Amino acid sequence: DLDLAKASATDQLKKAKAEAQVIIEQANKRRSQILDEAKAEAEQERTKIVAQ
Amino acid sequence: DLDLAKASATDQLKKAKAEAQVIIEQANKRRSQILDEAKAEAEQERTKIVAQ
């Protein structure tokens, strides 16, 4: 157990670390989607408003 | 050691999920800023062509 307390503790920590950051990797991908779309639709609405 | 490694490791992901929510909320709020800017400027554009 005094070996476990490192061998498995560090792995729990590492796995939690990697997942804690790749959650945010996916979330960054999502905000890329959102701030693409924010312009993509706004320009179409511009081209409607000034055709009106 | 094993219990504290479990604890501190597992709290990481609970923490990071809230920051994924931070990113998605910021995404949508700046998106609203995008749209609510483009709308008003397209309004002034149409008004300019109208006065012309």
Side-chain angles (χ1 to χ4, degrees), chain A residues 34-43, chain B residues 27-40:
Chain A
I34 279 162
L35 291 192
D36 161 281
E37 291 165 359
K39 333 309 206 317
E41 175 262 20
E43 196 66 3
Chain B
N28 281 292
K29 299 315 97 168
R30 159 37 59 152
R31 167 157 169 242
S32 305
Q33 296 149 34
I34 299 310
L35 209 178
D36 303 2
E37 281 182 359
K39 177 262 187 175

Side-chain angles (χ1 to χ4, degrees), chain B:
Chain B
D1 244 353
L2 203 73
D3 282 10
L4 84 93
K6 171 57 62 61
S8 151
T10 191
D11 78 37
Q12 298 178 110
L13 199 63
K14 310 170 196 180
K15 170 153 49 80
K17 274 184 174 181
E19 317 325 311
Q21 304 313 124
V22 164
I23 219 167
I24 287 178
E25 197 274 357
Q26 174 267 0
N28 281 292
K29 299 315 97 168
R30 159 37 59 152
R31 167 157 169 242
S32 305
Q33 296 149 34
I34 299 310
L35 209 178
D36 303 2
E37 281 182 359
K39 177 262 187 175
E41 186 50 39
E43 185 71 20
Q44 292 172 210
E45 173 64 17
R46 97 174 176 101
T47 302
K48 284 163 185 182
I49 168 59
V50 160
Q52 183 263 23

Side-chain angles (χ1 to χ4, degrees), chain A residues 4-46:
Chain A
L4 168 70
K6 302 78 169 82
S8 293
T10 190
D11 282 17
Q12 260 49 232
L13 184 69
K14 176 169 65 180
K15 291 178 299 186
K17 267 282 286 288
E19 289 303 322
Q21 196 40 224
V22 298
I23 277 284
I24 297 300
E25 178 58 36
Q26 176 279 329
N28 273 258
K29 143 68 173 73
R30 183 59 181 288
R31 188 235 64 189
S32 307
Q33 195 89 46
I34 279 162
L35 291 192
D36 161 281
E37 291 165 359
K39 333 309 206 317
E41 175 262 20
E43 196 66 3
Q44 187 256 38
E45 294 305 335
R46 173 173 183 78

